[PDB]
Amino acid sequence: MVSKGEELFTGVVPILVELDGDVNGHKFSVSGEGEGDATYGKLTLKFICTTGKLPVPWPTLVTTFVQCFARYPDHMRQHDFFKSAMPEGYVQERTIFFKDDGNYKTRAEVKFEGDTLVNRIELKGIDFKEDGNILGHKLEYNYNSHNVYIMADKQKNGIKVNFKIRHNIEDGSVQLADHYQQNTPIGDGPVLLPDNHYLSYQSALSKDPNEKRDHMVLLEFVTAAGIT
Ligand SMILES: [Cl-]
């Protein structure tokens, strides 16, 4: 049978993202909108900085900016925590360590509000260098493909996730961002606790030629794998 969580994702779902951020005291807000099509693992989103100029590079926020839209193969359906927690939702927490620089800590609440999948995020960044690659804006506007590794965390009725992102720096080098993540259901109901597996991401960043506000257009495809 198809679960109630699965059923919510069988079509195209509107997405709303709202973030409040503070990185080394630079305060900013971002709003995002678009659509997710989980059957195809497809995300299409546009983000706008509503407070003026974004004080960090847009690529550093890509991972923060709805893993319930991942395409899970039929044979791996019993391993899809994210959809199983819906519609009541889940809280995602991350620490993201930028090598030789500062760190972000994020808390995101992801749930349905009517037909819209909403993610409300608070991001706090500290210990950044004033002329490091982040606050000095030295990162290229592009994105590499990566795998995201998932395991159950029974004691929390959720999952633990870890992965490394390599951001290309303008001089040809790379800025590593080590991600540690936990997700916990908001409701008290049963969720699917997965066997170890991963999600494969591909991402493309672009600009809306008619948009004068600071913004990012993101197209992402996400597929679960590792169990066959
Ligand atoms: Cl940027």
The structural domains of the chain, ordered by start, are 1-228 (2.40.155.10)
Which technique?
Answer: X-ray
- Interval between CA 57 and ligand 1 midpoint (Å): 4
* Contact indicator for 128, 24 with CB cutoff of 8 Å: yes
Phi and psi dihedrals of 208, rounded to 5? -80, 115
Measure the CA–CA gap between 117 and 33, rounded to whole angstroms: 10
Instruction: Return d(Cα 34, Cα 117) in angstroms, integer.
Output: 10
Cα–Cα dist 82/185, whole Å: 9
What is the phi-psi region of residue 102: left when phi exceeds 0, alpha when psi lies from -120 to 50, beta otherwise? beta
Tokens encoding 76: 């791996």
**CA of 192 relative to ligand 1 center, distance in Å:** 37
Residue (of 206, 180, 203) closest to 41 by Cα position: 203
d(CA 87, CA 77): 17
DSSP three-state, residue 60 = helix
Strand, helix or coil at 82? helix
Ligand 1 centre to CA of 215 (Å) is 9
Q: Residue 88 carries which DSSP code?
A: T
Taking a 5 Å cut-off on Cβ, the residues next to ion ligand 1 are 57-58
Task: Using the mean position of ligand 1's atoms as its centre, give its distance from the Cα of residue 58 in Å.
Answer: 4
**Phi and psi angles of residue 57, each rounded to the nearest 5 degrees, phi first:** -70, 140
- CA–centroid distance, 53 to ligand 1, in Å, is 10
Q: Is there a contact between 199 and 220 (Cβ–Cβ < 8 Å)? A: no
Distance (Å) from CA 118 to ligand 1 centroid: 24
